[PDB]
Design a binder for this molecule. Sequence first.
Ligand SMILES: CCCCCCCN1CCC[C@H]1C(=O)N[C@@H](Cc1ccccc1)C(=O)O
Ligand SMILES: C=Cc1ccccc1
Ligand SMILES: [Cl-]
Length: 454
Amino acid sequence: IKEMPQPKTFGELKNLPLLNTDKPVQALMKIADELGEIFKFEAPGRVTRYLSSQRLIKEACDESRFDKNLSQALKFVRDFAGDGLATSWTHEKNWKKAHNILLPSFSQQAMKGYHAMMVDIAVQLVQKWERLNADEHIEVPEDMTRLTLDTIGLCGFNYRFNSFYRDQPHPFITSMVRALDEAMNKLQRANPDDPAYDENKRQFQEDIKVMNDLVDKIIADRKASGEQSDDLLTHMLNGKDPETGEPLDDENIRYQIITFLIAGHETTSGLLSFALYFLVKNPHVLQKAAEEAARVLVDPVPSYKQVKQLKYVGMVLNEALRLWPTAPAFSLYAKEDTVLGGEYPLEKGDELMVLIPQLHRDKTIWGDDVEEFRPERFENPSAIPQHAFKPFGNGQRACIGQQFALHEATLVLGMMLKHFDFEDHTNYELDIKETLTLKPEGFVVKAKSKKIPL
Ligand SMILES: CCCCCCCN1CCC[C@H]1C(=O)N[C@@H](Cc1ccccc1)C(=O)O
Ligand SMILES: C=Cc1ccccc1
Ligand SMILES: [Cl-]
């Protein structure tokens, strides 16, 4: 047995003020660099332990010993994502019911059916960049968020947010972004019942009503039409769980749609933004990826099978997820008393946080070049030890969207590399904004058309 390290304390507030920052995950990563593979974090009324090494995270990923916990972040998101897949407990009836119903809609086979709708949004992005004037620039995370939100809207419920037609977000998105901001801000809100926050609470309830009203209306409109569009909404209205024999109820369908729109806005857009950041900072990697895109994408419109052939592009995306996993942590609880790593005794109910960026910097796994962007480290994936690479979480509670997100990101990045040369015209300094997820704020490039028609 040994006692674990703990960062600096603030009297009665214990460690809590360490997270009073716009970049709390980055602050935790610096604490992990100082303290090592495990540290205790205390706040009034709570304790958790942050894990950074593959040695300990491999044990945390044992589903016989640990289950998914709702972090306080996810408990606050649950006020609008409800018992959708990401904000439900594994033991809630609606988790396994929705998992069984939706899993076949998210398989690699299912991606063939989404491909044409993904191409529709990807072509809108390429056309926008083709239509820029000389020495205009691209706002990268802004355009990647336009793309990923519109893709999940069109695949999620046959709804066009038309983000490439707008400066100001669709009103639904204004509300969702403000609700996510309120949820994350409440983690660092000193005394939440202060009347100073009556306005924040009124605004939060208005934002919840905006999201519910659009989504409930879309569901009610589809139910009435009987239209059988092959989207997640049709799958959810029709589908029955083989175990219970029950379908999802309309309220749970609404929470699943809200969940998918949160993920589409927050995650894939960060991955695409980081991937382009690393490509412009590593011109030899950019050249290799661009050569693959030109050799494979021989038709005006990429096919499903051609996207599967963009192997190096897939390695670039995995190497971006390694260094900056855009959903940067997940939480676990001990199912029973257990000892972690032969050293750290835990009681039933004890909470763990997995710091994915730190896991992905474990030199015992990756070697001394851990900060280098080297997609070739993914060439022989059978050599990677268990639980070393976890950008999609763990086990039965891993990301249901993994195949969707990687298909969309490989398609888009392949098209971007086929159609444009890129310049880091500002010599951009990485600045990572934290929302639910991580994204590179203020990242701009210039893109010179190779003048290849669509
Ligand atoms: C994809 C979304 C991932 C969420 C990542 C968590 C993102 N938190 C943002 C702050 C740090 C990080 C985290 O470690 N929070 C924990 C612990 C905690 C609880 C209450 C207040 C502050 C912190 C939690 O939310 O329980
Ligand atoms: C971490 C994934 C996630 C996805 C959607 C809503 C809340 C959380
Ligand atoms: Cl103290």
